[PDB]
Amino acid sequence: KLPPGPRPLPLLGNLLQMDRRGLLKSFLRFREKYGDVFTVHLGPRPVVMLCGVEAIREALVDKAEAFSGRGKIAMVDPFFRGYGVVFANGNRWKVLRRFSVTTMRDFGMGKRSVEERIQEEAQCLIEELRKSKGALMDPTFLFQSITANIICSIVFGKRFHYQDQEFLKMLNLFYQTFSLISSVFGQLFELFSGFLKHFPGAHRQVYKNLQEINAYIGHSVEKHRETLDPSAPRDLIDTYLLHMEKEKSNAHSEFSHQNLNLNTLSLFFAGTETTSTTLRYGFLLMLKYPHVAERVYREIEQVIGPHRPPELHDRAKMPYTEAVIYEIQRFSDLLPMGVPHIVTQHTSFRGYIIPKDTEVFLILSTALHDPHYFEKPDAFNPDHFLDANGALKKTEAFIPFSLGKRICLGEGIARAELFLFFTTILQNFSMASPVAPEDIDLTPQECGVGKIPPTYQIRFLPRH
Numbered sequence: 001k002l003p004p005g006p007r008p009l010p011l012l013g014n015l016l017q018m019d020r021r022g023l024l025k026s027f028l029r030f031r032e033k034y035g036d037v038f039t040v041h042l043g044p045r046p047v048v049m050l051c052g053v054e055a056i057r058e059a060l061v062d063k064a065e066a067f068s069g070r071g072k073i074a075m076v077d078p079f080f081r082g083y084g085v086v087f088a089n090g091n092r093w094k095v096l097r098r099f100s101v102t103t104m105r106d107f108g109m110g111k112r113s114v115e116e117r118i119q120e121e122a123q124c125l126i127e128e129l130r131k132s133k134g135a136l137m138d139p140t141f142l143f144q145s146i147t148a149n150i151i152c153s154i155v156f157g158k159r160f161h162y163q164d165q166e167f168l169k170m171l172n173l174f175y176q177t178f179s180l181i182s183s184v185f186g187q188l189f190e191l192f193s194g195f196l197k198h199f200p201g202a203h204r205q206v207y208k209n210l211q212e213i214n215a216y217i218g219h220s221v222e223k224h225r226e227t228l229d230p231s232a233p234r235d236l237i238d239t240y241l242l243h244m245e246k247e248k249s250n251a252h253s254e255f256s257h258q259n260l261n262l263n264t265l266s267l268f269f270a271g272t273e274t275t276s277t278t279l280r281y282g283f284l285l286m287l288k289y290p291h292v293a294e295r296v297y298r299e300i301e302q303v304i305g306p307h308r309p310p311e312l313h314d315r316a317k318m319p320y321t322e323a324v325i326y327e328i329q330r331f332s333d334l335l336p337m338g339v340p341h342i343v344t345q346h347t348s349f350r351g352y353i354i355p356k357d358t359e360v361f362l363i364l365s366t367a368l369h370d371p372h373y374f375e376k377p378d379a380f381n382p383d384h385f386l387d388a389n390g391a392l393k394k395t396e397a398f399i400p401f402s403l404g405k406r407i408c409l410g411e412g413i414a415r416a417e418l419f420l421f422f423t424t425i426l427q428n429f430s431m432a433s434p435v436a437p438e439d440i441d442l443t444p445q446e447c448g449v450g451k452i453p454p455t456y457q458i459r460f461l462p463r464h
């Protein structure tokens with residue numbers, strides 16, 4: 001039998017037992033009653049929730065033969081339709097995961113490492129903040145520009161300038177789209193898309209925004225193909241175009257133009273909106289807890305100094321700064337319910353039977369807030385990741401990128417981005433804002449698929 005859960009009504013599923021504050025709060029109320037493994041009916045679909053690091057790990061690691069499927073996010077399914085690595089399943093996922101892992105890591109002889117691309121971008125960012133004259137800003141656009149530019153360097157062999165209005169228009173579409181998908185309407189759509197799709201709504205705007213970004217991608221593909229040198233691929237798009245040409249006699253080849261456009265858009269969305277949202281939370285946390293920002297700056301002065309650019313080899317020597325970044329990720333809890341999975345075959349789990357095709361949510365938020373691993377888990381406290389001697393204390397509960405076959409494929413890049421960009425900004429700038437620390441409100445602006453911080457203003461003041 002499926003795991004236990006609240007009794008549903010036909011058509012409405014468990015609607016009348018949900019919490020108006022959203023899906024995550026609804027599921028944490030059900031966890032109170034049912035424990036770590038339970039079923040909730042989201043409209044017409046039974047979805048099994050797994051909570052706590054033990055259960056999520058038993059599923060994604062111990063039973064990866066069954067739990068490695070990708071489930072559906074209703075607000076974006078109409079667009080992606082199972083194309084791209086994020087939303088693919090089956091053999092398509094195998095091929096696209098392998099291609100994407102290889103091309104996001106290996107760039108050719110004579111090409112910059114991920115590290116150098118981040119270090120270059122971080123110097124562009126510092127120059128922009130110096131030219132910002134200490135003015136107030138919402139730093140969103142810059143955190144999206146630096147993260148998007150790392151991916152653009154890999155995918156398109158170039159970066160965009162921070163002043164490029166056409167680049168900013170695309171970043172505005174990523175930002176609005178992640179907010180829409182995470183809205184109360186987007187969560188209602190997860191329950192009732194069958195019915196709601198026939199009316200006007202945010203799902204239509206999400207579709208329009210994604211198509212607008214994808215239009216750029218399609219045109220870039222067309223240009224790349226026009227100038228492609230098979231002997232010298234310039235970037236990930238050329239590499240995929242050479243696979244496409246190799247397999248062109250197979251009508252079923254997975255190297256198709258829809259996979260190319262949507263894999264590429266998936267890489268940008270996942271690599272831009274994630275890390276820039278974490279940076280957004282990270283700097284709002286530094287405004288609320290300036291003594292943490294001061295102690296990081298102390299550590300940068302002591303290990304790096306005021307001038308030499310941070311490098312990844314510095315991390316080992318900077319346990320307090322790394323604890324801070326771990327704690328920003330833990331606290332931010334970017335994807336509280338992770339990204340939906342589905343089971344790929346009939347599975348037994350803890351005495352229950354989960355039929356092939358059942359959707360499963362791994363509630364990552366419950367690991368990141370497990371009070372056995374993090375004392376007082378609702379408070380921001382970098383000591384969560386430090387032992388008594390101030391050495392870094394890593395923990396198996398720290399799973400913000402998930403686990404198993406679908407584990408975030410950008411994990412290495414994201415962690416390098418968080419560390420180089422956080423340290424290079426704090427090396428050169430301190431932070432201030434009009435709101436006193438006591439008054440800063442960390443309550444997210446949206447909390448659905450994504451947890452998104454409230455807008456805020458910040459100044460970066462040059463040091464010395």
Ligand code: HEM
Pocket residue numbers: 070085086087097104151266267270271272274275278334335338339340400401402403405406407408409410411413414
């Ligand atoms: C702080 C930054 C990030 C966080 C917290 C994060 C988190 C996650 C999570 C929780 C998943 C779902 C894994 C699952 O299905 O169980 C995921 C998937 C994914 N992420 Fe990340 N992500 C981050 C940054 C990035 C970056 C920088 C990239 C691109 C370089 C990226 C690319 C992807 C891709 C392509 C997938 C789909 C993997 C698949 O289905 O095989 N992520 N991410």
Ligand SMILES: OC[C@H]1O[C@H](O[C@H]2[C@H](O)[C@@H](O)[C@H](OCCCCCC3CCCCC3)O[C@@H]2CO)[C@H](O)[C@@H](O)[C@@H]1O
Pocket residue numbers: 148152160166167170213215216217219268
């Ligand atoms: O290609 C079809 C569309 O072409 C024209 O659009 C342009 C606009 O001319 C043109 O200014 C523009 O430039 C965007 C440049 C920055 C791209 C930033 C990338 C960041 C990473 C993810 C992909 C986007 O791209 C759009 C699509 O190529 C039109 O303006 C739209 O009408 C039209 O539908």
Ligand SMILES: CC1(C)[C@@H]2CC=C(CBr)[C@H]1C2
Pocket residue numbers: 073076086178181269270271273274335339450
């Ligand atoms: C927003 C995310 C956390 C990242 C990019 C796209 C997603 C689905 Br629209 C998930 C994976």
